[PDB]
Design an enzyme around this catalytic site. Structure first.
Site, PDB file in Angstrom:
ATOM      1  CG  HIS A 321      -2.058   1.051   1.037  1.00  0.00           C
ATOM      2  ND1 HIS A 321      -3.314   0.748   0.556  1.00  0.00           N
ATOM      3  CD2 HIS A 321      -2.059   2.386   1.273  1.00  0.00           C
ATOM      4  CE1 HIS A 321      -4.046   1.847   0.514  1.00  0.00           C
ATOM      5  NE2 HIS A 321      -3.307   2.856   0.943  1.00  0.00           N
ATOM      6  CB  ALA A 322       1.290   3.961  -2.488  1.00  0.00           C
ATOM      7  CG  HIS A 351      -3.020  10.804  -3.428  1.00  0.00           C
ATOM      8  ND1 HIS A 351      -4.154  11.459  -3.000  1.00  0.00           N
ATOM      9  CD2 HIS A 351      -2.488  10.217  -2.331  1.00  0.00           C
ATOM     10  CE1 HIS A 351      -4.311  11.262  -1.703  1.00  0.00           C
ATOM     11  NE2 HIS A 351      -3.310  10.516  -1.271  1.00  0.00           N
ATOM     12  CD  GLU A 352       1.419   8.046  -2.309  1.00  0.00           C
ATOM     13  OE1 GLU A 352       2.115   7.279  -1.617  1.00  0.00           O
ATOM     14  OE2 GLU A 352       0.456   8.688  -1.848  1.00  0.00           O
ATOM     15  CG  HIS A 355       0.730  12.734   0.734  1.00  0.00           C
ATOM     16  ND1 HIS A 355      -0.155  13.387   1.564  1.00  0.00           N
ATOM     17  CD2 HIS A 355       0.115  11.591   0.351  1.00  0.00           C
ATOM     18  CE1 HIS A 355      -1.267  12.680   1.661  1.00  0.00           C
ATOM     19  NE2 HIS A 355      -1.125  11.582   0.940  1.00  0.00           N
ATOM     20  CD  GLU A 379      -4.313  11.765   2.647  1.00  0.00           C
ATOM     21  OE1 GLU A 379      -4.188  11.210   1.532  1.00  0.00           O
ATOM     22  OE2 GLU A 379      -3.492  11.610   3.575  1.00  0.00           O
ATOM     23  CG  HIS A 481      -6.636   3.501   5.055  1.00  0.00           C
ATOM     24  ND1 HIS A 481      -6.676   2.870   3.829  1.00  0.00           N
ATOM     25  CD2 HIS A 481      -5.987   4.673   4.854  1.00  0.00           C
ATOM     26  CE1 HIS A 481      -6.082   3.629   2.927  1.00  0.00           C
ATOM     27  NE2 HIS A 481      -5.659   4.731   3.523  1.00  0.00           N
ATOM     28  CE1 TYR A 491      -6.485   9.079   1.790  1.00  0.00           C
ATOM     29  CE2 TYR A 491      -7.281   7.872   3.709  1.00  0.00           C
ATOM     30  CZ  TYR A 491      -6.254   8.216   2.847  1.00  0.00           C
ATOM     31  OH  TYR A 491      -4.995   7.692   3.038  1.00  0.00           O
TER      32      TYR A 491
HETATM   33  O1  LIG Z   1       1.840   8.143   3.004  1.00  0.00           O
HETATM   34  C1  LIG Z   1       0.792   8.527   3.475  1.00  0.00           C
HETATM   35  N1  LIG Z   1      -0.396   7.963   3.278  1.00  0.00           N
HETATM   36  C2  LIG Z   1      -1.232   7.133   2.603  1.00  0.00           C
HETATM   37  C3  LIG Z   1      -1.556   5.793   3.250  1.00  0.00           C
HETATM   38  C4  LIG Z   1      -0.801   5.585   4.561  1.00  0.00           C
HETATM   39  C5  LIG Z   1      -1.132   6.297   5.736  1.00  0.00           C
HETATM   40  C6  LIG Z   1      -0.413   6.108   6.926  1.00  0.00           C
HETATM   41  C7  LIG Z   1       0.654   5.195   6.955  1.00  0.00           C
HETATM   42  C8  LIG Z   1       0.999   4.487   5.791  1.00  0.00           C
HETATM   43  C9  LIG Z   1       0.275   4.686   4.602  1.00  0.00           C
HETATM   44  P1  LIG Z   1      -1.817   7.662   1.048  1.00  0.00           P
HETATM   45  O2  LIG Z   1      -2.985   8.537   1.461  1.00  0.00           O
HETATM   46  O3  LIG Z   1      -0.787   8.425   0.276  1.00  0.00           O
HETATM   47  C10 LIG Z   1      -2.376   6.546  -0.131  1.00  0.00           C
HETATM   48  C11 LIG Z   1      -1.519   5.518  -0.801  1.00  0.00           C
HETATM   49  C12 LIG Z   1      -2.087   5.503  -2.218  1.00  0.00           C
HETATM   50  C13 LIG Z   1      -3.546   5.942  -2.125  1.00  0.00           C
HETATM   51  C14 LIG Z   1      -3.731   6.643  -0.779  1.00  0.00           C
HETATM   52  C15 LIG Z   1      -4.858   6.008  -0.013  1.00  0.00           C
HETATM   53  O4  LIG Z   1      -4.657   5.271   0.960  1.00  0.00           O
HETATM   54  N2  LIG Z   1      -6.057   6.329  -0.504  1.00  0.00           N
HETATM   55  C16 LIG Z   1      -7.319   5.838   0.046  1.00  0.00           C
HETATM   56  C17 LIG Z   1      -8.441   6.630  -0.643  1.00  0.00           C
HETATM   57  C18 LIG Z   1      -8.469   6.521  -2.151  1.00  0.00           C
HETATM   58  C19 LIG Z   1      -8.892   5.422  -2.893  1.00  0.00           C
HETATM   59  N3  LIG Z   1      -8.767   5.699  -4.217  1.00  0.00           N
HETATM   60  C20 LIG Z   1      -8.269   6.955  -4.356  1.00  0.00           C
HETATM   61  C21 LIG Z   1      -7.944   7.741  -5.485  1.00  0.00           C
HETATM   62  C22 LIG Z   1      -7.439   9.039  -5.301  1.00  0.00           C
HETATM   63  C23 LIG Z   1      -7.250   9.552  -4.009  1.00  0.00           C
HETATM   64  C24 LIG Z   1      -7.568   8.781  -2.884  1.00  0.00           C
HETATM   65  C25 LIG Z   1      -8.079   7.485  -3.072  1.00  0.00           C
HETATM   66  C26 LIG Z   1      -7.486   4.342  -0.132  1.00  0.00           C
HETATM   67  O5  LIG Z   1      -8.436   3.777   0.445  1.00  0.00           O
HETATM   68  O6  LIG Z   1      -6.678   3.696  -0.846  1.00  0.00           O
HETATM   69  O7  LIG Z   1       0.831   9.705   4.315  1.00  0.00           O
HETATM   70  C27 LIG Z   1       1.769  10.762   4.152  1.00  0.00           C
HETATM   71  C28 LIG Z   1       1.468  11.848   5.168  1.00  0.00           C
HETATM   72  C29 LIG Z   1       2.420  12.167   6.154  1.00  0.00           C
HETATM   73  C30 LIG Z   1       2.157  13.171   7.099  1.00  0.00           C
HETATM   74  C31 LIG Z   1       0.942  13.861   7.056  1.00  0.00           C
HETATM   75  C32 LIG Z   1      -0.012  13.541   6.074  1.00  0.00           C
HETATM   76  C33 LIG Z   1       0.250  12.542   5.126  1.00  0.00           C
HETATM   77 ZN   LIG Z   2      -2.668  10.331   0.720  1.00  0.00          ZN
END
Ligand SMILES: O=C(NC(Cc1ccccc1)P(=O)(O)[C@@H]1CCC[C@H]1C(=O)N[C@@H](Cc1c[nH]c2ccccc12)C(=O)O)OCc1ccccc1
Ligand SMILES: [Zn+2]
Ligand SMILES: *[C@@H]1O[C@H](CO)[C@@H](O[C@@H]2O[C@H](CO)[C@@H](O[C@@H]3O[C@H](CO[C@H]4O[C@H](CO)[C@@H](O)[C@H](O)[C@@H]4O)[C@@H](O)[C@H](O[C@H]4O[C@H](CO[C@@H]5O[C@H](CO)[C@@H](O)[C@H](O)[C@@H]5O)[C@@H](O)[C@H](O)[C@@H]4O)[C@@H]3O)[C@H](O)[C@H]2NC(C)=O)[C@H](O)[C@H]1NC(C)=O
Ligand SMILES: *[C@@H]1O[C@H](CO)[C@@H](O)[C@H](O)[C@H]1NC(C)=O
Ligand SMILES: *[C@@H]1O[C@H](CO)[C@@H](O)[C@H](O)[C@H]1NC(C)=O
Length: 598
Positions: A321-322, A351-352, A355, A379, A481, A491
């Site tokens: 999971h990214a 998206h990444e 961040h 986000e 999550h 989100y």
């Molecule tokens: O890396 C992450 N976070 C993510 C997941 C994560 C959180 C915490 C620890 C480890 C990992 P991700 O949201 O990039 C993340 C990785 C790729 C998609 C994103 C996601 O989860 N999206 C949600 C929602 C979603 C689904 N489809 C989409 C399409 C577009 C936007 C969101 C979205 C999902 O359920 O997957 O957080 C960075 C950060 C640091 C400090 C403050 C704020 C943020």
């Molecule tokens: Zn994110």
């Protein structure tokens, strides 16, 4: 006296913030190493460093009581001190904290290590969610195959960790109460600095809900024509395994069978990306290009040197999971993504990088301010770019969309495609936290925990499991999550506010005018717009230095979270869809699901 103390306090904060960045750097490095390489040794290392940082945080929170910070003149100093009093999990006793960390890694590692057997080959049992199972869920139109993979995954990623999840809820609650929140719900909600935040979201959701009902109704109608009435009933919740996603969070993967005008173009650039020889590296470089084109910050060398942008080809276990990573120094920022060459993944890259851009924009702030204005802001950033990347306008520019005629019918197809991603997601996201809040608040008895999950999924999204579930199953943690203890409301907030950002960015770019038919919001491309970039810089550079309404104000002069912009974007679809459902006598709404037995 207080005048001299406030001077001393400023110096205390300056030094402490620097110490916190440096200590957190060490924790983040150990967390990175574990996420990249799941081993018992790396687990131990990650959790031990965290225990050490938690111990220091306790001392920090204790030291704040030596300063009369509530009496200070400076709002900035007071805001920093308040941030330091908030321990979260670090408020737990040493042993309880260590147990929580062990519980959390147990759940994350379980999720990451899930492997199922091939539907057609019971010998081959090395299919992971990313990419093997997700490929089937998104591409197969064999409903029994889909149901097989659904059951296999949920049993392994969900049910297998019930006892761990139960202990997690207990310790999460204990932590919240030690911080004097009623529960973990209130602890999460504190990040939005607004005592009416829940009601605000209920109000916005209520406004958009009727549009969701129409999309739901139409998709169900179209699925009946594809699968037949034995698989999909007219009046019941949609069987979720037919929606192109393991959790039915977005339905864009089934666009080819539910699109309004099947004889007209539907944007799907994955094949062209492969044809042009796209790579994960190229995708990230293109993302970088988008940000820099807006006069925003270029990715530093550490990013390219240290990121993982492809799934490792050795036998190792890792979290696919990214995630985006801030290491709290200067320019040490990283992504770990198991990148695939698809349209959806191209959006994920942006998206990444949203961040990462936020990290770079606020890295000059004191440590406590090096986070999003609220979790929803973080986000939203990359999604604003993704909205423009997804337009036919932009996709033609980069040669990924060929021979496209943007007539009225093609426009409805594209709007619908976007809605399958953006509107469909709203009830899903709300339920992820409505569920966990209800457990955190002690509102659901343990005997009713699984069907409480499916009841919300039914009530809000009108979807249900492909097979009968009971309290013998435990399905919530099958979602990343939930296993990984990541708040989800961020989100829902993002999907609302990103349209406020997009609308304003488009207006600033001269790309949107509500009275100009040649400049529709749904075809706006903010690429190359320094004016849009300026708004981003003004907002993102603030980090968490001010309450989020001030950060929104820095972007576009507004201070209120509003559903106006998302409704504005989808208004042409709403008009068309309401009429289409009437024309086709489409049934709207659903009976209560029979798929979770009490
Ligand atoms: O890396 C992450 N976070 C993510 C997941 C994560 C959180 C915490 C620890 C480890 C990992 P991700 O949201 O990039 C993340 C990785 C790729 C998609 C994103 C996601 O989860 N999206 C949600 C929602 C979603 C689904 N489809 C989409 C399409 C577009 C936007 C969101 C979205 C999902 O359920 O997957 O957080 C960075 C950060 C640091 C400090 C403050 C704020 C943020
Ligand atoms: Zn994110
Ligand atoms: C979550 O909420 C909790 C309350 O539900 C809260 O816990 C309370 O924190 C208080 C500290 O802020 C603490 O108050 C202290 O109480 C001491 C005696 O309490 C004992 O007896 C109680 C029975 O009556 C028991 O229930 C307790 O368990 C204790 O055994 C006092 O000795 C202590 O006093 C000292 O400190 C005050 C502070 O004064 C302030 O600061 C300056 C001083 O520099 C003053 O100039 C200023 O005016 C201001 O008042 C001094 O005035 C005094 O001289 C002493 O030095 C203090 O009152 C309380 O015991 C504790 N528990 C309970 C049940 O109330 C948590 O802190 C909250 N958690 C979070 C994270 O916010
Ligand atoms: C994974 O971690 C192990 C020890 O836990 C280490 O020896 C090994 O080098 C790591 N593997 C890779 C590919 O980095
Ligand atoms: C680019 O951003 C800088 C500040 O980061 C600003 O001074 C400059 O005006 C911007 N360039 C353009 C062309 O707007």
């Amino acid at each position: 006296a207080l005048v001299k103390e406030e001077i001393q306090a400023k110096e205390y904060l300056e030094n402490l913030n620097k110490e916190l960045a440096k200590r957190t750097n060490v924790e983040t490095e150990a967390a990175w190493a574990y996420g990249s390489n799941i081993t018992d040794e790396n687990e131990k290392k990650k959790n031990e460093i965290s225990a050490e940082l938690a111990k220091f945080m306790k001392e920090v929170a204790s030291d704040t009581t030596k300063f009369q910070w509530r009496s200070y003149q400076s709002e900035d100093l007071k805001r920093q001190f308040k941030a330091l009093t908030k321990l979260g999990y670090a408020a737990l006793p040493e042993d309880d904290y260590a147990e929580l960390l062990d519980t959390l890694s147990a759940m994350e590692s379980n999720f990451a290590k899930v492997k199922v057997c091939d539907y057609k080959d019971s010998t081959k049992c090395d299919l992971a969610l990313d990419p093997e199972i997700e490929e089937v869920i998104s591409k197969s139109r064999d409903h029994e195959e889909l149901a097989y993979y659904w059951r296999e995954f949920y049993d392994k990623a969900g049910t297998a960790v019930r006892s761990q999840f139960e202990r997690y809820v207990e310790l999460n609650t204990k932590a919240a109460k030690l911080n004097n929140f009623t529960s973990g719900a209130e602890a999460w909600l504190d990040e939005y600095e607004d005592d009416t935040f829940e009601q605000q979201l209920e109000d916005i959701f209520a406004d958009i809900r009727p549009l969701y009902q129409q999309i739901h109704g139409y998709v169900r109608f179209r699925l009946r024509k594809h699968y037949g009435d034995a698989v999909v009933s007219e009046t019941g919740p949609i069987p979720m395994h037919l929606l192109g996603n393991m959790w039915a969070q977005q339905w864009s993967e089934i666009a080819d069978i539910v699109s309004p005008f099947p004889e007209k173009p539907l944007v799907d650039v994955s094949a062209e990306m492969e044809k042009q020889g796209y790579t994960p590296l190229k995708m990230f470089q293109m993302g970088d290009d988008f940000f820099t084109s807006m006069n925003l910050t270029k990715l530093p060398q550490d990013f390219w040197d240290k990121s993982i942008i492809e799934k490792p080809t050795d036998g190792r276990d890792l979290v696919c999971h990214a995630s985006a990573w801030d290491f709290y120094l200067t320019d040490d920022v990283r992504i770990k993504q198991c990148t695939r060459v698809t349209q959806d993944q191209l959006f994920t890259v942006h998206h990444e990088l949203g961040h990462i851009q936020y990290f770079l924009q606020y890295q000059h702030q004191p440590f406590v301010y090096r986070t999003g204005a609220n979790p929803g802001f973080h986000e939203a950033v990359g999604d604003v770019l993704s909205l423009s990347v997804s337009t036919p306008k932009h996709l033609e520019k980069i040669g990924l969309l060929k021979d496209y005629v943007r007539d009225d019918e093609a426009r409805i197809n594209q709007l619908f495609l976007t809605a399958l991603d953006k509107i469909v997601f709203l009830p899903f996201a709300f339920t992820m936290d409505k569920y966990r809040w209800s457990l955190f608040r002690g509102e659901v008895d343990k005997a009713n925990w699984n069907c409480a999950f499916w009841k919300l999924r039914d009530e809000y999204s009108g979807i249900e499991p492909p097979v009968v579930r009971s309290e013998k199953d435990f399905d919530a943690p099958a979602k990343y999550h939930i296993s990984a203890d990541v708040e989800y409301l961020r989100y829902l907030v993002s999907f609302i506010i990103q349209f406020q950002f997009y609308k304003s960015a488009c207006i600033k770019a001269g790309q949107y005018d509500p009275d100009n038919v040649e400049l529709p919001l749904d075809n706006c491309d903010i690429y190359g717009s320094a004016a849009a970039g300026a708004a981003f810089h003004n907002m993102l550079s603030m980090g968490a230095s001010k309450p989020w309404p001030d950060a929104l104000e820095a972007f576009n002069g507004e201070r209120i979270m509003s559903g106006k912009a998302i409704a504005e974007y989808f208004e042409p679809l709403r008009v068309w869809l309401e009429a289409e459902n009437i024309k086709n006598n489409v049934h709207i709404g659903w009976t209560t699901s029979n798929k979770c037995v009490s």
